Coordinates of C-alpha atoms (C1' of nucleotides) in Angstrom, one line a residue:
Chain A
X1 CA 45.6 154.2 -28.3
X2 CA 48.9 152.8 -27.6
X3 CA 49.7 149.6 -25.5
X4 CA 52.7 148.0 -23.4
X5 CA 53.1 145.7 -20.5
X6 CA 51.0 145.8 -17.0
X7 CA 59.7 138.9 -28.1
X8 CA 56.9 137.2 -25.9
X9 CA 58.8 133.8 -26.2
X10 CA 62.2 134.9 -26.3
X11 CA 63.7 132.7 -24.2
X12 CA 62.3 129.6 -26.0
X13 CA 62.2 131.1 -30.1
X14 CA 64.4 133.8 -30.2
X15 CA 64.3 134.7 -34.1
X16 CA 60.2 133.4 -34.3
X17 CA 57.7 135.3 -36.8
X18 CA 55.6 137.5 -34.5
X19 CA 51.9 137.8 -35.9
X20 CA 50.7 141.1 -33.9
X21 CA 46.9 140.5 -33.8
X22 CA 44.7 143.7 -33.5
X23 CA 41.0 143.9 -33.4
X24 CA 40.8 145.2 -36.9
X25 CA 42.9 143.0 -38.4
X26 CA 41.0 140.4 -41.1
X27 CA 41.9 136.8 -40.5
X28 CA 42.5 136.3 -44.1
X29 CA 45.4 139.0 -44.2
X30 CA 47.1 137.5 -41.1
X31 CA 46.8 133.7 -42.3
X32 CA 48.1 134.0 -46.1
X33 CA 51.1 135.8 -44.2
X34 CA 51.9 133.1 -41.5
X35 CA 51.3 130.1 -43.8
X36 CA 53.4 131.9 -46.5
X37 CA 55.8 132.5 -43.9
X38 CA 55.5 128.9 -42.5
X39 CA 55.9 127.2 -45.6
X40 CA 59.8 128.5 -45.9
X41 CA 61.5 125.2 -44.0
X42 CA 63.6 128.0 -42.7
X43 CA 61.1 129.6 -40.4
X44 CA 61.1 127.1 -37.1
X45 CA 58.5 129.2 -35.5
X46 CA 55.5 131.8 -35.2
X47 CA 54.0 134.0 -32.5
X48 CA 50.3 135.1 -32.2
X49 CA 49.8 137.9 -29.8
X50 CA 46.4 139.9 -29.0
X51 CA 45.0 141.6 -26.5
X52 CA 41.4 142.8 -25.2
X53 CA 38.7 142.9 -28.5
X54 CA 42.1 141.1 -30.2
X55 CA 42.0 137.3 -27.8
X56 CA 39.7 135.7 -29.6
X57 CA 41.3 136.3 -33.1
X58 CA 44.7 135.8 -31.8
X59 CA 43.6 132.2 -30.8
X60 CA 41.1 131.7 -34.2
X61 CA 44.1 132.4 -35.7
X62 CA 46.2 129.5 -34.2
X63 CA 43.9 127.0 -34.3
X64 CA 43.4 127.7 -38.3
X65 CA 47.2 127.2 -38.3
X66 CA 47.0 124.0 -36.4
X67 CA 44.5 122.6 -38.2
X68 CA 46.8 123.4 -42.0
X69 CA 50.3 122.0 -40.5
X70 CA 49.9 119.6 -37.9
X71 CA 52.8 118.6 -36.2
X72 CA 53.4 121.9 -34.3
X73 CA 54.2 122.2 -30.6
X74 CA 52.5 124.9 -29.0
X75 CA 52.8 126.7 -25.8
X76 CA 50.3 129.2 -24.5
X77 CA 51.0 132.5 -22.2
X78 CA 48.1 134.7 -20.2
X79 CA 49.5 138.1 -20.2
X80 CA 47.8 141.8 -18.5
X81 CA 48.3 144.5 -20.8
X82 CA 47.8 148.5 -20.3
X83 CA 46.3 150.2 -22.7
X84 CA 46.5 154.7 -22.4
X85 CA 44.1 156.2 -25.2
X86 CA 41.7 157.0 -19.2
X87 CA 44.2 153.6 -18.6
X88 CA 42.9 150.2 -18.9
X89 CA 44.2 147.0 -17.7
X90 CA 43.3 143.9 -20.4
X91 CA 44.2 140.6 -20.3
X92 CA 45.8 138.7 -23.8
X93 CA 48.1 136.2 -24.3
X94 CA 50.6 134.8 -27.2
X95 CA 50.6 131.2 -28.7
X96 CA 53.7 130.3 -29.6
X97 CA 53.9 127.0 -32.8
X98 CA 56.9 125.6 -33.3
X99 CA 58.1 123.1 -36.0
X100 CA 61.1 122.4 -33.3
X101 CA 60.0 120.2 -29.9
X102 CA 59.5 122.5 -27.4
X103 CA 60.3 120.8 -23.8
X104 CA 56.8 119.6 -22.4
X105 CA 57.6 120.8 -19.0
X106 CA 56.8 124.3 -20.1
X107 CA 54.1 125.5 -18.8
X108 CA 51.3 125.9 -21.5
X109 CA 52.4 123.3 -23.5
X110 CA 50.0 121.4 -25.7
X111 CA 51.3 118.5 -27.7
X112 CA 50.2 118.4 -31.2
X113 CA 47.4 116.2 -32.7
X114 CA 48.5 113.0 -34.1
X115 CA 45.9 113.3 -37.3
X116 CA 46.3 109.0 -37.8
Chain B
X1 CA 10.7 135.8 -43.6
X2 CA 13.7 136.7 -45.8
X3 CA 16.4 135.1 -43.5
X4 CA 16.2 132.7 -40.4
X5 CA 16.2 133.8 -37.4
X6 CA 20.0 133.4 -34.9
X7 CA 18.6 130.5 -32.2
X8 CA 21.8 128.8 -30.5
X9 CA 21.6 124.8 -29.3
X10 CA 23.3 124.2 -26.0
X11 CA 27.0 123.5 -27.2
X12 CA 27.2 119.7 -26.7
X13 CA 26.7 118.6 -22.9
X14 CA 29.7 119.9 -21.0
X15 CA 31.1 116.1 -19.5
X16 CA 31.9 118.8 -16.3
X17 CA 34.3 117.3 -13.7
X18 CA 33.5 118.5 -10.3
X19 CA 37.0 121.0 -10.7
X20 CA 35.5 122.0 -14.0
X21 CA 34.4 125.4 -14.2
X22 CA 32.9 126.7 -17.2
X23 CA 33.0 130.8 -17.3
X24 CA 30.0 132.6 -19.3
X25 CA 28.9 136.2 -20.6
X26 CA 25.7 136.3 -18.2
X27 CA 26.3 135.7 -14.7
X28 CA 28.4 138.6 -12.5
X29 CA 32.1 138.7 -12.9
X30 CA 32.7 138.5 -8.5
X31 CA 30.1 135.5 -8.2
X32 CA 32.1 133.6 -11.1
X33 CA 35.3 134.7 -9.2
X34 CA 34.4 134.2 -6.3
X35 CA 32.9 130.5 -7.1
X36 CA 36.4 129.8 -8.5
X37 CA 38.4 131.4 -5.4
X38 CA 36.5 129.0 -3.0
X39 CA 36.7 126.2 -4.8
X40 CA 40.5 126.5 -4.5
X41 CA 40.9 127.5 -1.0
X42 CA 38.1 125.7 0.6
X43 CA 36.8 126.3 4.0
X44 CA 38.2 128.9 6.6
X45 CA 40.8 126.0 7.3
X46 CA 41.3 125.2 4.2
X47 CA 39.3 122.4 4.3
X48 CA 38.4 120.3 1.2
X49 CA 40.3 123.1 -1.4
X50 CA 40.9 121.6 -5.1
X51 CA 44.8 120.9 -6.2
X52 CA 43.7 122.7 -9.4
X53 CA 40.5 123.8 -11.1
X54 CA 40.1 124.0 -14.9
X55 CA 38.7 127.2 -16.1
X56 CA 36.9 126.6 -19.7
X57 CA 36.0 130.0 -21.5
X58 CA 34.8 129.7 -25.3
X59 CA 34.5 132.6 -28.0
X60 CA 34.5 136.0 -25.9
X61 CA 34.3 134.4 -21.8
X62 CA 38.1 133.8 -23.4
X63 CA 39.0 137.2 -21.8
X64 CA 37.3 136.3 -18.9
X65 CA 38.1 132.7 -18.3
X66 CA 41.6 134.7 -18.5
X67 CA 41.0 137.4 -16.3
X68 CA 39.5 135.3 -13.8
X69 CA 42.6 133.1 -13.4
X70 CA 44.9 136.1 -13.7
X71 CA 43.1 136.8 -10.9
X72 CA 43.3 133.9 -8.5
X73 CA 47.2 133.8 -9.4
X74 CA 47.7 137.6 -8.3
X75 CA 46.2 137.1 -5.0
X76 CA 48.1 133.8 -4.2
X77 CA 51.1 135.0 -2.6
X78 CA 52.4 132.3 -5.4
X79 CA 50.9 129.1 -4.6
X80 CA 48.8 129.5 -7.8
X81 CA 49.9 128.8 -10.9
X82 CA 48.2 129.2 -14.4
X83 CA 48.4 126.4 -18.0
X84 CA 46.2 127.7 -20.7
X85 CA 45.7 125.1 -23.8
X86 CA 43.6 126.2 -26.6
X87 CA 41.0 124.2 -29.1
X88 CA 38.4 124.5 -31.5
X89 CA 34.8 124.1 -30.8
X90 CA 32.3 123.2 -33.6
X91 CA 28.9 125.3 -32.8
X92 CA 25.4 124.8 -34.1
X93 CA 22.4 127.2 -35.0
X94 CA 19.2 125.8 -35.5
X95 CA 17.6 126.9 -38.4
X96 CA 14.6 124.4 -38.7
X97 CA 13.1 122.4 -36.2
X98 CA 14.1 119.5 -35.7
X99 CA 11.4 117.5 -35.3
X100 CA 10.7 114.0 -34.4
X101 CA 10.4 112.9 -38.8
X102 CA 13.4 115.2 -39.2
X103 CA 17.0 115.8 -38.6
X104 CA 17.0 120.0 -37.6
X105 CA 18.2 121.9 -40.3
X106 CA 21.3 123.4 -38.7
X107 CA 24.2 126.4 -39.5
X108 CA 27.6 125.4 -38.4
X109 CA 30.0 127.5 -37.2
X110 CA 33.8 127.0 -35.4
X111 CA 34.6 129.3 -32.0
X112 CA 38.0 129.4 -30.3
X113 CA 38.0 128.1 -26.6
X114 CA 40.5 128.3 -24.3
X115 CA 41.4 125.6 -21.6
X116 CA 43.4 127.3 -18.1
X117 CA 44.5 124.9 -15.6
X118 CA 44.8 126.8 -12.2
X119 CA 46.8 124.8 -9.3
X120 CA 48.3 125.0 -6.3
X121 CA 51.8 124.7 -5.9
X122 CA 53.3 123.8 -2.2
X123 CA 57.0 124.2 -0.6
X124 CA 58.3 120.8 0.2
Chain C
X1 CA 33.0 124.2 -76.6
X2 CA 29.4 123.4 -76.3
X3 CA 27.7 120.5 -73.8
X4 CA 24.4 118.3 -74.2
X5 CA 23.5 114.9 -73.4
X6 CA 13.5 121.0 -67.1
X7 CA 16.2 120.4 -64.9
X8 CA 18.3 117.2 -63.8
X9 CA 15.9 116.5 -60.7
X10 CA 13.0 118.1 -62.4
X11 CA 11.4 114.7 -60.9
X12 CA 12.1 115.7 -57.0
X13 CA 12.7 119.3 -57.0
X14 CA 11.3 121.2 -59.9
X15 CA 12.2 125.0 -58.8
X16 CA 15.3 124.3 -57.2
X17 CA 18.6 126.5 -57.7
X18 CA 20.6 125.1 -60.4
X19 CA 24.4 125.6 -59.7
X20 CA 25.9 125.2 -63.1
X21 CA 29.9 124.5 -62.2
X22 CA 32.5 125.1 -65.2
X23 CA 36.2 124.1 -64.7
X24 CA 37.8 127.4 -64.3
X25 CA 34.5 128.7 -61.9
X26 CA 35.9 129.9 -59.0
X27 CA 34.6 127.7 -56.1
X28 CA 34.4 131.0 -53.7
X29 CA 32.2 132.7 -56.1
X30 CA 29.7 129.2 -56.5
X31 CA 29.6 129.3 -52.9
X32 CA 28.6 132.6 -51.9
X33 CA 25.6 132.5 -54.3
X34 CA 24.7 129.0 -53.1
X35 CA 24.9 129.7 -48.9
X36 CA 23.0 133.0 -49.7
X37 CA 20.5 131.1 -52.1
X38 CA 19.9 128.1 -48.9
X39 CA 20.1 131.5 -46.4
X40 CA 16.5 132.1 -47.8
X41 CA 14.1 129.7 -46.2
X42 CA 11.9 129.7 -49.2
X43 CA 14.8 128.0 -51.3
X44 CA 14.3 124.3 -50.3
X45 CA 17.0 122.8 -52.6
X46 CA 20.1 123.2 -54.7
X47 CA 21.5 121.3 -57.5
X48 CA 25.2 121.4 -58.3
X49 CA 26.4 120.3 -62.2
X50 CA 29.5 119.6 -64.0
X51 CA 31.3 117.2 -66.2
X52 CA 34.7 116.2 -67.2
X53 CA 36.9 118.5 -65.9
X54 CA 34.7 120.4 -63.6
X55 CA 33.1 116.9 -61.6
X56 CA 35.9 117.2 -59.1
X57 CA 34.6 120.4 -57.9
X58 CA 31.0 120.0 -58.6
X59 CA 31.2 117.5 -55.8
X60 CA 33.5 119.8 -53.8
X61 CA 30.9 122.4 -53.9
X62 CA 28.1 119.7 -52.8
X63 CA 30.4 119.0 -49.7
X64 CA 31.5 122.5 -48.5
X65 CA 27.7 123.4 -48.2
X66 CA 27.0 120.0 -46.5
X67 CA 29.9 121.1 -44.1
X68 CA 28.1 125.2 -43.6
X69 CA 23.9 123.1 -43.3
X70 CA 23.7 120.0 -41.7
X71 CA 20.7 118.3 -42.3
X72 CA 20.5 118.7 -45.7
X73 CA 19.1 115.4 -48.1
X74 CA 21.7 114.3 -50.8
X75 CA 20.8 112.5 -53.8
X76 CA 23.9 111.9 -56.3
X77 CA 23.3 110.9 -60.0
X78 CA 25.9 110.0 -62.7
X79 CA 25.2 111.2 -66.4
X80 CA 27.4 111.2 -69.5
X81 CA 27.4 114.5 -71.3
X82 CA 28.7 115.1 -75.3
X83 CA 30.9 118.2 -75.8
X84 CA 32.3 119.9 -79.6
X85 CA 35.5 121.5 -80.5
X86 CA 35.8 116.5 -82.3
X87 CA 32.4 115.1 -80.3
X88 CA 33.8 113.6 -77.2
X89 CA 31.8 111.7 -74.2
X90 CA 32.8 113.1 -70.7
X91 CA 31.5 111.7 -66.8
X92 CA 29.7 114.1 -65.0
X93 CA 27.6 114.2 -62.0
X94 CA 24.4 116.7 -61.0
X95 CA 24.1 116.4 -56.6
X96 CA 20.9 117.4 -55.0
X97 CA 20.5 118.7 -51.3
X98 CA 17.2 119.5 -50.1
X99 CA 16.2 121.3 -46.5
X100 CA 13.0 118.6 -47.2
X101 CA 13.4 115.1 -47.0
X102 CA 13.5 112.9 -50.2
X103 CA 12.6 109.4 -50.2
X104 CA 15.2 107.1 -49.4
X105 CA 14.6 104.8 -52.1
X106 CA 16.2 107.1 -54.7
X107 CA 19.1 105.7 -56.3
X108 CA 22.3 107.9 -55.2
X109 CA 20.3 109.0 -51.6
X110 CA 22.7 109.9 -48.8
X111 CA 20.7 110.4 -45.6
X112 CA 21.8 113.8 -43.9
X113 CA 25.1 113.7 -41.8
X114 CA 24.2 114.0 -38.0
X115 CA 26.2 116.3 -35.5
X116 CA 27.1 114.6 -32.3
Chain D
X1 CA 65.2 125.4 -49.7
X2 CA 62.9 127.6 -50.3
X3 CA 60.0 125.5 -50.2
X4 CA 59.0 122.2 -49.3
X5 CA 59.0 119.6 -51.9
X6 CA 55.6 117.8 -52.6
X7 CA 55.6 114.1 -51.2
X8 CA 52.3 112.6 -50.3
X9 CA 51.0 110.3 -47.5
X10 CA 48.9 107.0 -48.3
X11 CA 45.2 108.1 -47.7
X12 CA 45.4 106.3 -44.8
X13 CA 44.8 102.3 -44.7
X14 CA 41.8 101.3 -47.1
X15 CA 39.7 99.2 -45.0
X16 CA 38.8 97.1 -48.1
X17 CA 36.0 94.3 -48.2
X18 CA 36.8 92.0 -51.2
X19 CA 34.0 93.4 -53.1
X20 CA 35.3 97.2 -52.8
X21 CA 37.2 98.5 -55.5
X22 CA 39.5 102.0 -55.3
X23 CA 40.4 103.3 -58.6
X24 CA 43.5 105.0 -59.4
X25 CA 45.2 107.3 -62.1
X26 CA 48.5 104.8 -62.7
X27 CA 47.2 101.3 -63.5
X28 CA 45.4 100.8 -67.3
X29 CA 41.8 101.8 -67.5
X30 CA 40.4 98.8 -69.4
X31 CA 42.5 96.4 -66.6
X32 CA 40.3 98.3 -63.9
X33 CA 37.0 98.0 -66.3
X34 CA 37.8 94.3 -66.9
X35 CA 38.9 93.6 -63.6
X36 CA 35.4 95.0 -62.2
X37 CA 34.0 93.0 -65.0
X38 CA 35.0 89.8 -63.5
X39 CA 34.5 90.2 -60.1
X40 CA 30.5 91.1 -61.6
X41 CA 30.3 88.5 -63.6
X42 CA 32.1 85.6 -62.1
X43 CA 33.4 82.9 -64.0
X44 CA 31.7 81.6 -67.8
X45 CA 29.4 79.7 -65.7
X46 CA 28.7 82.7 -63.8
X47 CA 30.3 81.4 -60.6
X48 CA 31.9 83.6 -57.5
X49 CA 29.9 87.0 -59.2
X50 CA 29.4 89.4 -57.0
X51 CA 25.7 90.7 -56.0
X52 CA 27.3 94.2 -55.6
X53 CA 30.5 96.1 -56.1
X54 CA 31.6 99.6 -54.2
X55 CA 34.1 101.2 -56.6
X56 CA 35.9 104.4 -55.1
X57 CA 37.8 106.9 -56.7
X58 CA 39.3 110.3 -54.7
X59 CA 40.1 113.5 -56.6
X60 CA 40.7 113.5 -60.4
X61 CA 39.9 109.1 -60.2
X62 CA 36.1 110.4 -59.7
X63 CA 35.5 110.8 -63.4
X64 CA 37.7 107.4 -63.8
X65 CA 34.8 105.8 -61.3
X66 CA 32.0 107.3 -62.6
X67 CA 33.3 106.1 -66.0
X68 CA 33.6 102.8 -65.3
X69 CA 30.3 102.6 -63.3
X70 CA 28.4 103.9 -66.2
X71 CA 30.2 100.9 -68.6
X72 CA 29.6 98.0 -66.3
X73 CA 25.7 99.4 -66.5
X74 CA 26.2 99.8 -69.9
X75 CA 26.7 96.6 -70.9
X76 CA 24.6 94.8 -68.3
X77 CA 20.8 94.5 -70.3
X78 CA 20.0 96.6 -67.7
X79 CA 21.0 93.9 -65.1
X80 CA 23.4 96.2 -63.1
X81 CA 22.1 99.5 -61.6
X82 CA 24.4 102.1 -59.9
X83 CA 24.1 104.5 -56.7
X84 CA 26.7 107.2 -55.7
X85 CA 27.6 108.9 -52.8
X86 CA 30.3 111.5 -52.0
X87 CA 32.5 112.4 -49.1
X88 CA 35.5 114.0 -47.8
X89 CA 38.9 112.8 -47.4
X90 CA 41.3 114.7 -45.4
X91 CA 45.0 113.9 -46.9
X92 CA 48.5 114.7 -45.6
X93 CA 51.5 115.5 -47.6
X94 CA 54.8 115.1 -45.6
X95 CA 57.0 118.1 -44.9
X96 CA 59.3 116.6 -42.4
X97 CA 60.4 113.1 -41.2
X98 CA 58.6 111.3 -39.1
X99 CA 61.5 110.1 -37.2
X100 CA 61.4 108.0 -34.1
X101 CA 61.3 110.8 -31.6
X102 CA 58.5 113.3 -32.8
X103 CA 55.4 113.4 -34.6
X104 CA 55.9 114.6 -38.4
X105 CA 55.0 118.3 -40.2
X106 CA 52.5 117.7 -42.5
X107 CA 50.3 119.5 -44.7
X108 CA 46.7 118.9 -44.8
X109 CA 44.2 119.0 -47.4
X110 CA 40.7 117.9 -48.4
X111 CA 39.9 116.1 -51.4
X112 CA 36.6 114.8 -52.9
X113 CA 35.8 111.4 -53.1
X114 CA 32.7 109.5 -54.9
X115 CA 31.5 105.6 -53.8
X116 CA 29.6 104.0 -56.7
X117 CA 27.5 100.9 -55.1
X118 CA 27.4 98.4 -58.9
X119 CA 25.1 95.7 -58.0
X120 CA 23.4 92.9 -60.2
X121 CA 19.2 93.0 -60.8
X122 CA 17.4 90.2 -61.8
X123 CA 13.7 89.4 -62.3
X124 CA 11.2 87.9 -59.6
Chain E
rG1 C1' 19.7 136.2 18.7
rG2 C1' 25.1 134.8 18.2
rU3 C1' 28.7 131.4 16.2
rC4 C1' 30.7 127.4 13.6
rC5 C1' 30.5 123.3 10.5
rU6 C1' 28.4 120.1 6.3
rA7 C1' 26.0 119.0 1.4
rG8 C1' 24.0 121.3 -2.9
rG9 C1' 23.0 125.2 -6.6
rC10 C1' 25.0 129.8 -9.0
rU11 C1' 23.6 130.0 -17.7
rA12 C1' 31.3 127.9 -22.1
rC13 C1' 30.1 132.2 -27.8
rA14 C1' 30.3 139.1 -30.7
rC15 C1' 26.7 134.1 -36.7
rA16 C1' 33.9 137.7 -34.7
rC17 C1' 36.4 130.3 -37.7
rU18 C1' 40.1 132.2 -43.0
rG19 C1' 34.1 137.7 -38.9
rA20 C1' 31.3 142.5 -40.9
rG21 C1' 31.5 147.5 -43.0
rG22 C1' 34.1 151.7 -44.4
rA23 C1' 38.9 154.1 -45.9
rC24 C1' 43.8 153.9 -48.1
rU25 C1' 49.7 152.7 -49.9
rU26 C1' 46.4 145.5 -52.7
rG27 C1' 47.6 144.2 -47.1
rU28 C1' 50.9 141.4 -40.0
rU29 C1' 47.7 148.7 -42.6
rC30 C1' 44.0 152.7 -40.5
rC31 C1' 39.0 153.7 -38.7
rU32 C1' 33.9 151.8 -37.1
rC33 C1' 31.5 147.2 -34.8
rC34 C1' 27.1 149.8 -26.8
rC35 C1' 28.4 147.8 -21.1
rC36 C1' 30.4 143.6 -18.6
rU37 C1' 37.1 145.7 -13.4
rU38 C1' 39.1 142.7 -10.7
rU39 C1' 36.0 138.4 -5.3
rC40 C1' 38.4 138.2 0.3
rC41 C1' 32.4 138.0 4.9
rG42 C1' 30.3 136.7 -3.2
rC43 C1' 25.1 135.1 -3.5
rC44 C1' 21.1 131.4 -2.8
rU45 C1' 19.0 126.4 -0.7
rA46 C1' 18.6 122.6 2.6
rG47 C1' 20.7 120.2 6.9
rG48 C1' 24.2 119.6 11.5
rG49 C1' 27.1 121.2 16.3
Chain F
rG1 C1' 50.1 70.5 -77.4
rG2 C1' 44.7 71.2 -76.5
rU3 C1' 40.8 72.3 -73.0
rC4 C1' 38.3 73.4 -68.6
rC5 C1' 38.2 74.6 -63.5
rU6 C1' 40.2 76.7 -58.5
rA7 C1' 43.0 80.3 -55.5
rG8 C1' 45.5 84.7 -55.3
rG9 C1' 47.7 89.5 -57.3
rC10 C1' 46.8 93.8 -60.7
rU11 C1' 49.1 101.6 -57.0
rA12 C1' 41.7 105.9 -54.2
rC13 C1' 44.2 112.6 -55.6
rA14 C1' 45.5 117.9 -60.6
rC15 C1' 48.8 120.8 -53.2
rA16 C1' 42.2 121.7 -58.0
rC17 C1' 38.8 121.8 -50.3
rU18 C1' 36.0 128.0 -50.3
rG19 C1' 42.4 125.5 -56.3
rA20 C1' 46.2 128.7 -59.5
rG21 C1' 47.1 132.7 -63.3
rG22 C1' 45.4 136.0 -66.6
rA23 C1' 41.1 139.1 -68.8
rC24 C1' 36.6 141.9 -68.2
rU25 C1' 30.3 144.6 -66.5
rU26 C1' 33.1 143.3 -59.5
rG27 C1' 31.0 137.7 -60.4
rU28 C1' 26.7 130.7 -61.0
rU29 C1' 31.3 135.5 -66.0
rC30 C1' 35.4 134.6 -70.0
rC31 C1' 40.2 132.6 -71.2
rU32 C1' 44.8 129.4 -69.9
rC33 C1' 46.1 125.0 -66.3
rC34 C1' 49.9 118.2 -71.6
rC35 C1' 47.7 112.5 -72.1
rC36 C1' 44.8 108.9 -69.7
rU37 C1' 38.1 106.2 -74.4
rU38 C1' 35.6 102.8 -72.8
rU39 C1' 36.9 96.0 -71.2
rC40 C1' 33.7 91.4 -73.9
rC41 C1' 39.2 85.2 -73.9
rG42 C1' 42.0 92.1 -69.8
rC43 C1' 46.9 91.0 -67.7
rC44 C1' 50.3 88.1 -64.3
rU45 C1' 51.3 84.0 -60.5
rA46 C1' 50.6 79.4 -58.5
rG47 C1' 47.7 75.0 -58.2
rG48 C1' 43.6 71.1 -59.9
rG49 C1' 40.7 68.0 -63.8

RNA sequence: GGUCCUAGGCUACACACUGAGGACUUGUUCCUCCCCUUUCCGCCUAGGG
RNA sequence: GGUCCUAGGCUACACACUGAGGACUUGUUCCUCCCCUUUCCGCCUAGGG
């Protein structure tokens, strides 16, 4: 199997962590990465990107984030993806959380949770 | 028995707005389509279209709830656009019944849902 | 290091599984053998234990499987429990949750958190 | 820096009745023993008592409640009897400033907390 | 029979939320974990020009 | 100075919430993770018999 289109954020978190969610993957491996990686004040920002059997993990896998720091801005982004291993077109996305205010007018935006 | 038995309760009541659409595993992909194309287009002149739907797909309808407004968008010529927000959505197995004596004895679990604002954008 | 002052809700729940916590037990561990244990529907109710310094986590135990089974019947009593090397008194705490009811009249009965 | 340092946020507000009593791990024991005491017993005449207190301790002040509790019953003739309950407090340690523009990074946790209803029996 | 309109209806989840099981230099690893694609006149009820 | 009263004040956490680090027939395991014990006229502030 290998994949490609049919950083994901770029233009808005150029240096960001990217998490590259796969079906396989256990949640527990990716998370004690990205937390580790998040609690360095120096990391702004993290990626999670899936695909196909991967969507639902990629967002399980934000939302657990969400719910250890709050205070992150988020932006979601629906993305096709082709996958050769007899072509497939599969849809995914990438969640981008950001320490850093990300401008609201983006589309995908979601505003953090106050937790009062 | 050794080990209850999976039985799902009906997550929550869905507070549906009439532009809600809720995507799910069992119906046919064209008729959920479909149901989502019209209500964005309306009639055959365009009469009583939505601005924008929301498309609400939890645990694996996320692909689809996706795919279906991945879909709308492509065939738009650009006057639709897409806003997915995520969230977390607390689900319960009954493992007793409840019945009127008892609260149910219940399993508790967490699924991902995903939230996809689909609306029409106009020249002017 | 040995504790003293069949079971400490022989009175409601004679057979029940008896989750000994030490300071040091891993909470992980505790819980996989308690969620298994409930996972039966013959095992009605579980007791969770400790003193001193494992009471913080003998009630942390009671409230992660209250958070996996909701419905569960709580019933919290407070104990003193002597310890040698030096015979010192420590607080302690043994928490019962039952899939059956228990009568709210009990002293330390918390009726079962509802999901709305 | 490596790593955030490790400020904490005040559990929230406590929404505190006269009669409820949080224990803590700064102020003396015997201060919080006696000043439970007192608000029990009232004055020499046994004016202003209380018919019940709620003391509440989070984290390692559970022992320091239960402690307490078990004193005040202790020392009662068996006039004061004692009921727990538990629960779970979420609790937020700051990261970053909360500064007048944007909502603050925070950290957030669970901790344990125990609620110890005191309250005075007397015959008839 | 033909053609238009109108008002409804058309099931949120893989126990996949710190998932499962195997393998291996532990850990953003590899493998395994049946199908669900892609509407343009969608389908089904009533009712009205 | 003595004695009584009244009103108020007296800091919820071990990042210990699927904790941390070692050890070992993995897992209700062992070991390490400083003190906080226990009032009886408690302490402090103001005011009144």
């Amino acid at each position: 199997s290998e994949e490609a289109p049919a950083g994901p954020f770029a233009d808005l978190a150029p240096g960001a962590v990217h998490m590259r969610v796969k079906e396989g993957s256990k949640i527990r491996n990716l998370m004690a990465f990205a937390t580790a990686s998040m609690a360095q004040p120096a990391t702004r920002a993290i990626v999670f990107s899936g695909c196909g059997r991967a969507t639902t993990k990629t967002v399980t896998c934000a939302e657990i984030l969400k719910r250890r720091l709050a205070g992150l801005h988020q932006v979601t982004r629906l993305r096709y993806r082709s996958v050769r291993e007899v072509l497939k077109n599969v849809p995914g996305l990438a969640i981008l959380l950001s320490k850093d205010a990300l401008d609201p007018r983006q589309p995908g935006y979601q505003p953090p949770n106050p937790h009062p | 028995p050794v080990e209850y038995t999976l039985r799902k309760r009906l997550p929550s009541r869905l507070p549906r707005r009439p532009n809600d659409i809720y995507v799910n595993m069992k119906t046919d992909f064209k008729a959920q389509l479909a149901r989502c194309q019209k209500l964005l287009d309306g009639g055959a002149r365009g009469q009583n279209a939505c601005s924008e739907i929301y498309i609400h797909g939890l645990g694996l309808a996320i692909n689809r709830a996706i795919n279906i407004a991945l879909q709308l968008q492509a065939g738009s010529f650009g006057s639709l656009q897409v806003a997915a927000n995520t969230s977390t959505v607390e689900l319960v197995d009954e493992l007793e019944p409840e019945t009127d004596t008892r609260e149910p004895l219940t399993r508790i679990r967490n699924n991902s849902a995903i939230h996809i604002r689909v609306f029409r954008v106009t020249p002017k």
